[PDB]
Structure formats: structure tokens, C-alpha cells
């Protein structure tokens, strides 16, 4: 549910979405 | 079984790796002799405490770096910003 609001919310704020492609690239 | 099982794709390297982007993203290391210092420790230990937590909460590495990134995210865009 909270999941759900920040996810739904943030994926609306793509810094979110570079910051997951760049944790993706940084770590492992 | 375990951590969710997912475990076995987060090795030890990975999880400290992820502390470290935790700890760069709330404050950037200048050098790493700056973990020394009790007010960078402290980032270390939260960073740590975060990482635990959400390892120990998500049923997935999916979910984790969810939740990982979805914090240093709060951190700046909900907190300071």
C-alpha cells in the first residue's frame, strides 16, 4: 500500500528512475 | 528459507557496496578517510541500520532496491528539497 503511493507517486519524478538506473549501474 | 531466500544474489561485496551508496548519497565522501570521523560513523551506522532493515523487510532484491533507492530519493527530493 505504502509501497504502492511512494512507487506510483515517485515513479511520477523521474530523478527517482535515474537514481534506480544508477544504483543498478554503480553497485553490482 | 533464509532471507527470503533472494539472499543468495546479495553477497556480502554487494551489501557494502549499497552502505557505501547509501552513506555517498546522504553525504559525499570526499576520501575515504573521512568514515574516521564520528559524524561520518554515525552516516555509516544509519546507512547500515537502513540497509539491514530493508534487507530484512523486503521479499526481494527487486523490492530491496525498491526501497534503497526510494530512500536516498526521500532523503533528498522528501527531506531537504
Known amino acids: 500500500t505504502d509501497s504502492q503511493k511512494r512507487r506510483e507517486i515517485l515513479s511520477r519524478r523521474p530523478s527517482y528512475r535515474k537514481i534506480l538506473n544508477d544504483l543498478s549501474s554503480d553497485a553490482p | 528459507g533464509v532471507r527470503k531466500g533472494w ?26 578517510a573521512a568514515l574516521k570521523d564520528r559524524r561520518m560513523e554515525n552516516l555509516v551506522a544509519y546507512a547500515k541500520k537502513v540497509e539491514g532493515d530493508m534487507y530484512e523487510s523486503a521479499n526481494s532484491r527487486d523490492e530491496y532496491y525498491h526501497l534503497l533507492a526510494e530512500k536516498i530519493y526521500k532523503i533528498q527530493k522528501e527531506l531537504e528539497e
Open chain 2, 7 to 32: 539472499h543468495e544474489h546479495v553477497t556480502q561485496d554487494l551489501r557494502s557496496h549499497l552502505v557505501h551508496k547509501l552513506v555517498q548519497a546522504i553525504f559525499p565522501t570526499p576520501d575515504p
